[PDB]
Amino acid sequence: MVQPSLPQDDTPDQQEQRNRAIAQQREAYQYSETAGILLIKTLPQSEMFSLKYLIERDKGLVSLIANTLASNIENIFDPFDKLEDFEEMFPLLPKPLVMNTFRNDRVFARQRIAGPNPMVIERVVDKLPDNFPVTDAMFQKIMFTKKTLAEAIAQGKLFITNYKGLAELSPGRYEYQKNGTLVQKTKTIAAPLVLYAWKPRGSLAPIAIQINQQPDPITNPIYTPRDGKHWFIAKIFAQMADGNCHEAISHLARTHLILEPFVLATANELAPNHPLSVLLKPHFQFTLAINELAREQLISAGGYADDLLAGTLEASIAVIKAAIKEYMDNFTEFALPRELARRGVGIGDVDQRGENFLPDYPYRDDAMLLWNAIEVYVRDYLSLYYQSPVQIRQDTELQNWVRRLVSPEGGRVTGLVSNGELNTIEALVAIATQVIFVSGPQHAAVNYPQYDYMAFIPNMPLATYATPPNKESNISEATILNILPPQKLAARQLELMRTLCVFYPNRLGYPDTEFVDVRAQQVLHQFQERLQEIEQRIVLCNEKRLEPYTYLLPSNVPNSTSI
């Protein structure tokens, strides 16, 4: 056990040992790339999943074998015979929480603030997009009000999800053997705009849905809750969009994959007894390995992204890389408070009374608790070792860490640092706070609702398989079943979500090995106590909330992105 220390404070012998360890780690953690995504060349055996991990994962897969044995779903590309069949896919699995109430407009809307992807909704200011021609008459008919759109917008009552980021997807293709002939079909993509309003007990309510980006009163009209089944179908497409942005942007890109350069830089530039390495590595546990499983089984040819998502694998990969690049180029701007403020849903986005324009936002409140607790944690921890900015500046290993991260072949994190150089303790506190928050809380918030909201296929199908029907046509059960995924791909989606949610590989603030520094043990203990308080506070709030939001309870938050 070696006391952590800054390299400039070590002896020449100690410094040479640090440099030898760094050389060996650079040999073991080499940089590689898959379709432009930075990954590791060869996973070190020390970075593999543990035996315990493998036992839990295997338990999940075997449970899926049993559940499939007890299920009546078939290995065919036909639709389900009945919509009710979707509720019979879980004979030996937990029932997804959204299953009973997914048709409800409020349950649809609340997934924007407490579902798997609570990262899209933004407050409308000035006007709606010109390609989203919602009219005063529509708004007044829906809200049963005399208020106009401009008055609602001026009051901060209107919110929007604009899935334009999917407009350029090449639709995915699928094929299968039927009666000795190969059948080839194409998925139907959509990039909807969804208008919500805060209705003051107060609830977020869906107002309008335009399924595609370019308006037309006949072929791409604005649907409202007054359009019955058509409205229902509209929501499906909206949900599909929210799913594709969830997996490509919010889950894979902006947790799993943007963490890879930080793990690799930590190995490539920080000695084992560097305080920042000691701080961060518990929050990298199994991250490289789970990202190798993402390479092998998710974003590979024939994998889950190919099978399930709306676009071709190439299109999905394009979306992922764009999300990564925007995150890295503006790293500091994706800190939780700034990210919330940029969408107009931060804690400072209040009306004249001081009340938030979006008062019900469980992800925001709980994630803010976790963010501030983490910030105090890394500030005190780093204060144990950095007292003057000169120690930051003269830490050659830390400087090489930054330089590796912003370099084009080390992650290209051009938004990581100001003035081209890391110079202050507080900037490092922000960096480490954001890394730890992403690895634990954020990944928990986007990963673990996947089963409750996405293993029940009709609530959030990862692709749609037929075009939106004409606004005047009659909608039968067969129409909806033809839009929803066929049996085999619904099975594959349940398979995926169950594997991604089966267990918690670790726990936030509880590393496998204690800190060597007793002072660091104290700071970590304080972090654990604060997590206890946060757990109690969230339990209280969940007593108050319309529905409990459990995904950011500290006991449900892993220490690292690891599943």
Q: Which sign does the torsion angle of CA 199, 203, 207, 212 carry?
A: positive
Q: Which segment (137-145, 248-256, 405-413, 415-423) binds Cl ion by CB under 5 A?
A: 405-413
Instruction: Tell me if 191 sits within 8 A of 215, measured CB to CB.
Output: no
Closest alpha carbon to 505 in 303, 296, 282: 282
Comparing CB distances to its own copies, the nearer of 72 and 155 is 72
Q: Which sign does the torsion angle of CA 118, 119, 125, 131 carry?
A: negative
**What single-letter DSSP state applies at residue 416?**
S
Comparing CB distances to Mn ion, the nearer of 447 and 493 is 447
Q: Name the binder of 68 from Mn ion, its own copies, Cl ion, none, CB < 5-8 A by kind.
A: its own copies
Comparing CB distances to its own copies, the nearer of 11 and 75 is 75
Closest alpha carbon to 262 in 392, 432, 503, 469: 432
Instruction: Tell me if 376 sits within 8 A of 426, measured CB to CB.
Output: no
Q: Name the binder of 38 from Cl ion, Mn ion, its own copies, none, CB < 5-8 A by kind.
A: Cl ion
| 447 is a site residue for Mn ion (CB under 5 A) | yes
- Residue ranges binding its own copies (CB under 8 A): 43, 45-46, 48-51, 54-55, 57-58, 61-62, 64-66, 68-71, 73-75, 91-92, 289, 292-293, 296-297, 488, 491, 495
Q: How far is the CB of 46 from Cl ion (least distance, A)?
A: 24
Q: Which segment (130-138, 297-305, 447-455, 540-548) binds Mn ion by CB under 5 A?
A: 447-455
**DSSP per position, 243-286:** HHHIIIIIIIIIIIIHHHHHHHHHHHHS-TT-HHHHHHGGGGTT
Comparing CB distances to Cl ion, the nearer of 32 and 467 is 32
Q: Is 447 annotated as a binding residue?
A: yes
Q: Is 274 annotated as a binding residue?
A: no
| 213 is a site residue for Mn ion (CB under 5 A) | no
Closest alpha carbon to 491 in 450, 466, 468, 461: 461
Comparing CB distances to Cl ion, the nearer of 33 and 514 is 33
| 432 is a site residue for Cl ion (CB under 5 A) | no
Q: Is 251 annotated as a binding residue?
A: yes
Report residue 168: phi and psi, to 5°.
-100, 10
| 506 is a site residue for Mn ion (CB under 5 A) | no
Instruction: Please calculate the CA angle 332-394-8 and round it to the nearest 5 degrees.
Output: 130
| 259 is a site residue for Cl ion (CB under 5 A) | no
Comparing CB distances to its own copies, the nearer of 90 and 381 is 90
**Which one among 6, 22, 38, 455 touches Cl ion, defined by CB under 5 A?**
38
| 257 is a site residue for Cl ion (CB under 5 A) | no
User: How far is it, in rounded angstroms, from Cα 243 to Cα 463?
Assistant: 8
358 three-class SS: coil
Where b means 16+ CB within 10 Å and e means fewer, 277-313 reads bbbbbbbbbbbbbbbbbbbeebbbeebbbbbbbbbbb
Element (H, E) at 389: helix 389-393
Q: How far is the CB of 497 from Mn ion (least distance, A)?
A: 11
Q: Is 256 annotated as a binding residue?
A: yes
Q: Which residues are annotated as a binding site?
A: 251, 256, 443, 447, 563
Please give the residue ranges that form the binding site for Cl ion (CB under 5 A). 38, 412
Q: Which residues are annotated as a binding site for Fe(3+)?
A: 251, 256, 443, 447, 563
